[model samples]
Target: GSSGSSGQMSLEGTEKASWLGEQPQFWSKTQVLDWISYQVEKNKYDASAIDFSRCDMDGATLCNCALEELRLVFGPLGDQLHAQLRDLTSSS
Candidate 1:
């Protein structure tokens, strides 16, 4: 049961709000995987192309700082999913 929407989710209030503002943030590992899976399900690109080798695993809870490294690894895709993950994690 999924809508398969490609648009990012919204984030109004949550723990990650400080780091990502009212946008999405990938706080948990599962959320990150889910977002990436969602992207792959949309046929945007091959999931294999993603490289998280350099992701700052330590600062993942640090908001903007975490996103900075994620941005580098995911490129433009990271930016797109950031909002969606933020919303999901916040509400969950």
Candidate 2:
């Protein structure tokens, strides 16, 4: 869903960011899937604000990467969410 009334996951370009972009040293396969799921399931707004489809298996710990690859997007996530997404997903 490109240009959807929300955000789309980025997999390429400098703006692109995904779980695959995560540090392998810190994020595990489970962590990546878990966090990605969390963000998409937060709500309709959250869901639309994040393009889980483009979400690659790459990610990192410090970066406000693209959540939605469109003109109008929302909170892709801040530092805390990045940590929480990894922590909450990893810890749990």
Candidate number with greatest lDDT: 1
Against the true structure, what is each candidate's TM-score? 0.43, 0.31
lDDT of 2 by residue, 7-65 (tens): 55753546343444544345544555555554555632345454444444433422234
Q: Which regions of candidate 1 are displaced past 4 Å? A: 1-31, 55-65
lDDT of each: 0.53, 0.44
**Pairs with backbone N, CA or C atoms under 3 Å apart (clashes), candidate 1:** 9-84, 24-83, 24-86, 25-86
RMSD of 1: 9.9
lDDT of 1 by residue, 1-92 (tens): 37955456753434542333332443554444544555665656666656765443433542444455556676666666566556555784
lDDT measured at residue 41 in model 2 versus the true structure, 0 to 100: 53
On TM-score, the leading prediction is 1
